[PDB]
Amino acid sequence: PRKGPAPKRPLVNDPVYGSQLVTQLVNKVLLKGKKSLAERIVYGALEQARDKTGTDPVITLKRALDNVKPALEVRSRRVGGATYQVPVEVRPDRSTTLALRWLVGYSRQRREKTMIERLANEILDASNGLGASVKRREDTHKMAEANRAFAHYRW
Amino acid sequence: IPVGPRLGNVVVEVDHLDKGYDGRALIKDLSFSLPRNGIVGVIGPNGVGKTTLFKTIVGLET
Amino acid sequence: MKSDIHPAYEETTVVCGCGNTFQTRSTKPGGRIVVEVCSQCHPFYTGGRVARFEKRY
Amino acid sequence: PRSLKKGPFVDEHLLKKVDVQNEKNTKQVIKTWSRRSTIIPDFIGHTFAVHDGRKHVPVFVTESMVGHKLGEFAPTRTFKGHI
Amino acid sequence: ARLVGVDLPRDKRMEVALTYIFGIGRTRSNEILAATGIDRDLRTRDLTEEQLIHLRDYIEANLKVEGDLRREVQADIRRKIEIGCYQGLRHRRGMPVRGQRTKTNARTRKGPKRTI
RNA sequence: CUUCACACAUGCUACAAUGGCCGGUACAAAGGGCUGCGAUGCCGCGAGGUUAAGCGAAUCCUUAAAAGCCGGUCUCAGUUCGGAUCGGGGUCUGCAACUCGACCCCGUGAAGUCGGAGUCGCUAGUAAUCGCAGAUCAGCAACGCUGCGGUGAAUACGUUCC
Ligand SMILES: Nc1ncnc2c1ncn2[C@@H]1O[C@H](COP(=O)(O)OP(=O)(O)O)[C@@H](O)[C@H]1O
Ligand SMILES: [Mg+2]
Ligand SMILES: [Mg+2]
Ligand SMILES: [Mg+2]
Ligand SMILES: [Mg+2]
Ligand SMILES: [Mg+2]
Ligand SMILES: [Mg+2]
Ligand SMILES: [Mg+2]
Ligand SMILES: [Mg+2]
Ligand SMILES: [Mg+2]
Ligand SMILES: [Mg+2]
Ligand SMILES: [Zn+2]
Structure with missing residues (x-):
């Protein structure tokens, strides 16, 4: 932090679907170190993402991510007696991270029975611009467009 | 509006419903789960079957 | 008023699991009232504390 | 005596006090300090005076105290209320 | 159904349905459903009428259920x-x-x- | 020293489906053992009981690791979640378990549906979770402390603010 920028860990491709996004997706479903249960859910939510679309599930996921990747998020700061949020431009590698927890994070609190389809019913709707994960990327934008006046506080 | 008892994780759920009348079939292939702590709006032009959808839910029309 | 406001009431043969049956009149539709216990599968015909240590306690 | 193998343990110095009086139909009072002892039905007929720390609280083993210890009849902590 | 005044619910297996009697848990239920032949998968909406009659005298000859078990x-x-x-x-x-x-x-x- | 009209503090188990209960089946490490450890066989639903093989131990015993993996089942309910309280019957150590022990079995089936203002820990084999062993010790309030491994994350723009 305060000295320099910290080094970054690499990633290994998933054997079932060769893609960096897939192991990065299994890694954030993971609670409690139970890793193979987290790959028994992401595989079961991509394989069920072709039973009712028929297309390739990686291509479904590269576009449901592209409907939840933000590019302009907002970031609080205090000046005097009023504290007011300043919009900042988002670097690309942070964008894929906020997008991907917006998939898993809303999928826990849907209304189905098991996590195998709750992640599937959110990858489905975000590929068409429907779900609650897509609701936030515009509220992240609309909160940060309704404050464009404070755009000269880049710290 | 008075406050009622505690609402569970299910409210009401409708899966692949079909209902109309004789030749005039007004509901085909509808599936939804009705949410918890929200306000649900039914939008549709007249003569489409918005009142009859609540006949099935209340249970006066199978 | 002893006309067509009272419920339907015709004779009704009733059986139990004990096998003792009888024939009375009641409002069950079909003569089909079925019990699992009766008044002749039972008597009305003929019928800690100091017992603690007797298992050498 | 908690286990049924070794039988119901009751201290010896009170067993001799009840056997000397039960044979000739004599029901005195007995001063004792053996809270650990269990009720045998051998001394249904007469009373006791069990210790608590102040003074020997009297107890009359009537018919259904048996099985329980003597010391369940002396509460040893007073507590008659915070107010 | 109705075993002994206790109102067995519907659509629930007998492995769990006998537990609603005051006096039968998960272990005594497994030995009621072995001495009277009834398997551990039988739902309550398809119980045979005399099969309940086998079920209501192994209990009332060996066990103690409520009415007097609350009195116990x-x-x-x-x-x-x-x-x-x-x-x-x-x-x-x-x-x-x-x-x-x-x-x-x-x-x-x-x-x-x-x-x- | 353990008492309670109540307040604080550190923990543990939880409120479930990334789960509960059943049947299969794998991969550890570091440790203790002669006042002992108890293989194996027989009996007991179970804690245990009883015989006695081997061993001052890289021998032999402690030992069978638990999560995990493959199948079934419950289908979102204060429940097949939860295991508190209370009845009943036992085992073990010990002169003795009543105030005041741990474990087992049977029935019961409490409060709780992710917690107000505030606040805490963690930058990598780390947090999170999963058991195993030791020191005290006759037995234990062993969920505590000291240790060991199994599985194994996310993020760090930056020094404006505390
Ligand atoms: N009792 C009935 N029998 C047959 N058809 C009916 C009956 N009541 C309503 N409908 C049909 O229902 C359709 C619309 O339902 P309706 O309740 O009128 O919807 P909305 O309330 O949205 O106007 C109409 O086509 C009408 O013909
Ligand atoms: Mg209408
Ligand atoms: Mg103290
Ligand atoms: Mg729930
Ligand atoms: Mg349970
Ligand atoms: Mg198992
Ligand atoms: Mg055996
Ligand atoms: Mg499974
Ligand atoms: Mg409640
Ligand atoms: Mg550091
Ligand atoms: Mg010890
Ligand atoms: Zn009868």
């Missing part, structure tokens, strides 16, 4: 209160009878907080 419990409390044992001077006051810590915890025999 509260009369055994009723004896301890009147003999004057300390454990019956403990049911008089709503305090734990098994030497539990009464300083910080023990809300269950007492009730929730009142902050006087």
Whole structure:
């Protein structure tokens, strides 16, 4: 932090679907170190993402991510007696991270029975611009467009 | 509006419903789960079957 | 008023699991009232504390 | 005596006090300090005076105290209320 | 169905349905459903009528179920209160009878907080 | 020293489906053992009981690791979640378990549906979770403390603010 920028860990491709996004997706479903249960859910939510679309599930996921990747998020700061949020431009590698927890994070609190389809019913709707994960990327934008006046506080 | 008892994780759920009348079939292939702590709006032009959808839910029309 | 406001009431043969049956009149539709216990599968015909240590306690 | 193998343990110095009086139909009072002892039905007929720390609280083993210890009849902590 | 005045529910297996009797848990239920042949997958909406009759005399010849089993419990409390044992001077006051810590915890025999 | 009209503090188990209960089946490490450890066989639903093989131990015993993996089942309910309280019957150590022990079995089936203002820990084999062993010790309030491994994350723009 305060000295320099910290080094970054690499990633290994998933054997079932060769893609960096897939192991990065299994890694954030993971609670409690139970890793193979987290790959028994992401595989079961991509394989069920072709039973009712028929297309390739990686291509479904590269576009449901592209409907939840933000590019302009907002970031609080205090000046005097009023504290007011300043919009900042988002670097690309942070964008894929906020997008991907917006998939898993809303999928826990849907209304189905098991996590195998709750992640599937959110990858489905975000590929068409429907779900609650897509609701936030515009509220992240609309909160940060309704404050464009404070755009000269880049710290 | 008075406050009622505690609402569970299910409210009401409708899966692949079909209902109309004789030749005039007004509901085909509808599936939804009705949410918890929200306000649900039914939008549709007249003569489409918005009142009859609540006949099935209340249970006066199978 | 002893006309067509009272419920339907015709004779009704009733059986139990004990096998003792009888024939009375009641409002069950079909003569089909079925019990699992009766008044002749039972008597009305003929019928800690100091017992603690007797298992050498 | 908690286990049924070794039988119901009751201290010896009170067993001799009840056997000397039960044979000739004599029901005195007995001063004792053996809270650990269990009720045998051998001394249904007469009373006791069990210790608590102040003074020997009297107890009359009537018919259904048996099985329980003597010391369940002396509460040893007073507590008659915070107010 | 109706085993002994107890109103067995519907659409629930017999492995769990007999547990609703006051006196049958998960272990005595497994030996009611072995001595009378009834398997551990039989739903309650398709019970045979005489198959319940086998089910209601193995219980009423060996076990003790309610009506008098509630009378077993509260009369055994009723004896301890009147003999004057300390454990019956403990049911008089709503305090734990098994030497539990009464300083910080023990809300269950007492009730929730009142902050006087 | 353990008492309770109540307040604080450190923990543990939880409120479930990334789960509960059943049947299969794998991969550890570091440790203790002659006042002992108890293989194996027989009996007991179970804690245990009883015989006695081997061993001052890289021998032999402690030992069978638990999560995990493959199948079934419950289908979102204060429940097949939860295991508190209380009845009943036992086992073990010990002169003795009543105030005041741990474990087992049977029935019961409490409060709780992710917690107000505030606040805490963690930058990598780390947090999170999963058991195993030791020191005290006759037995234990062993969920505590000291240790060991199994599985194994996310993020760090930056020094404006505390
Ligand atoms: N009792 C009935 N029998 C047959 N058809 C009916 C009956 N009541 C309503 N409908 C049909 O229902 C359709 C619309 O339902 P309706 O309740 O009128 O919807 P909305 O309330 O949205 O106007 C109409 O086509 C009408 O013909
Ligand atoms: Mg209408
Ligand atoms: Mg102390
Ligand atoms: Mg729930
Ligand atoms: Mg349970
Ligand atoms: Mg298992
Ligand atoms: Mg055996
Ligand atoms: Mg499974
Ligand atoms: Mg409640
Ligand atoms: Mg550091
Ligand atoms: Mg010890
Ligand atoms: Zn009869």
